[PDB]
């Protein structure tokens, strides 16, 4: 509930590491925007949402729970941000546009979450 098993700091500590990561993705705006905001299945027009990903998630909820402090363990934010590029991954059938957008997000992030997952977990 509170402290998983590893270190687990203040939701702000994490953010210190986490957010910067998200922020690298935030630079990848054309790749992050599709998530910086909720993955509107209406704006998208994909009723198949929640019927594939099961865990929608989006840099909106992400950059939020992070910022707001709805965390305690960094791997949680990771499992979410990754769960995000994931929706773009197993949802867009891979051969799509987000495919490129999520690819990077997970890339930079996997490159951002290193200084994080290391100083966070």
């Amino acid at each position: 509930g509170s402290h998983m098993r590893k270190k687990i700091f203040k939701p702000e500590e994490l953010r210190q590491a986490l957010m910067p990561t998200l922020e690298a993705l935030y630079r990848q705006d054309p790749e992050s925007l599709p998530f910086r905001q909720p993955v509107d299945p209406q704006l998208l027009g994909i009723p198949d949402y929640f019927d594939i990903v099961k865990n929608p998630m989006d840099l909106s909820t992400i950059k939020r729970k992070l910022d707001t402090g709805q965390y305690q363990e960094p791997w949680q934010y990771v499992d979410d941000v990754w769960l995000m590029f994931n929706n773009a991954w197993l949802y867009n059938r891979k051969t799509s546009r987000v495919y490129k957008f999520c690819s990077k997000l997970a890339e930079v992030f996997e490159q951002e979450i290193d200084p994080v997952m290391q100083s966070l977990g």
């Binding site: 998208l44 027009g45 773009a88 799509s96 546009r97 987000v98 957008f101």
Partner: peptide
């Protein structure tokens, strides 16, 4: 092509 429409940034459009 592409543009912002329909799905995410999808919007194939061919016909």
């Amino acid at each position: 092509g592409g543009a912002k429409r329909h799905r995410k940034v999808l919007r194939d459009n061919i016909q």
